[PDB]
Amino acid sequence: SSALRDGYRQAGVSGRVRSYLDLLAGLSDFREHFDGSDGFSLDLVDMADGPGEVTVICCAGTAAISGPHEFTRLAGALRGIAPVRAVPQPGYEEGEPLPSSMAAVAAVQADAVIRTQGDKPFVVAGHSAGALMAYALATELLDRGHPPRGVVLIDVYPPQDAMNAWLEELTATLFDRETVRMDDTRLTALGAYDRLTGQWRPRETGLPTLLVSAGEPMGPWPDDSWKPTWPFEHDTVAVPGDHFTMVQEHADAIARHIDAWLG
Ligand SMILES: [Ca+2]
């Protein structure tokens, strides 16, 4: 383990997760950054192949355990349904700098999408804060003449009461599902991205948008205001599972909705 990892777990246990996230963001300021115009680049990951003209491009999340591996199950379920690729969030792996802004990361991701796709159409997808990253990327691509055919936002909470109320539960569950180790590179990246997405605001694009919502909350709620939402026009479906299990244990349900929506 590490001091940062142990501290993060303790922040969950003691109900001080927001404080710990702000500390990680502060620490991240002392790492190397890229601004989008300094030559940094990255590649997409090929996850699966499938028929049709539209590739499903999945953006990695911003959790300390996030990465292209987050979409292995969804990709598995989409094999032979549609091509699938994954976009990394730079800075969660050794030797990668952190973006200095949402614009910087969106620019280098859009470079890689355009490089890889050419004029082959695609949709962009993401989960949780990864959905915000997906939408920022979609916006950048639209602003560059390469609009996606649409955006799939899986359990997005835009700038969040339920997420705030569940921060401790979220943190404990991340450790239960730590299939990729939360090293200090990952924890400081979590800080940086958490601050970037928290300060960012989505712009209206007119893009077809599919909100994929968890079927149930991670804790009791008095009304239905625990659900993911999105401020711009979008279609909505619900799948079995909670914030976490929806896109892993129940990724097949998400695959079927994506299949229908692409139809
Ligand atoms: Ca510069």
UniProtKB/Swiss-Prot annotation:
Positions that bind substrate: 62, 129, 155
Misc: Type I modular polyketide synthases (PKSs) catalyze the step-wise condensation of simple carboxylic acid derivatives. Organizationally, type I PKSs are arranged into modules, wherein each module is comprised of a set of catalytic activities that is responsible for a single elongation of the polyketide chain and the appropriate reductive processing of the beta-keto functionality. A minimal elongation module contains an acyl transferase (AT) domain, an acyl-carrier protein (ACP) domain, and a ketosynthase (KS) domain.
Transmembrane feature ranges: none
Subunit organization: Homodimer. Erythronolide synthase is composed of EryAI, EryAII and EryAIII multimodular (2 modules) polypeptides each coding for a functional synthase subunit which participates in 2 of the six FAS-like elongation steps required for formation of the polyketide. Module 1, 2, 3, 4, 5, and 6 participating in biosynthesis steps 1, 2, 3, 4, 5, and 6, respectively.
Protein name: Erythronolide synthase EryA3
Functional note: Involved in the biosynthesis of antibiotic erythromycin via the biosynthesis of its aglycone precursor, 6-deoxyerythronolide B (6-dEB).
Record organism: Saccharopolyspora erythraea (Streptomyces erythraeus)
Top-level taxonomy: Bacteria, Bacillati, Actinomycetota, Actinomycetes, Pseudonocardiales
Region (Thioesterase): 57-261
Residues annotated as catalytic: 128, 243
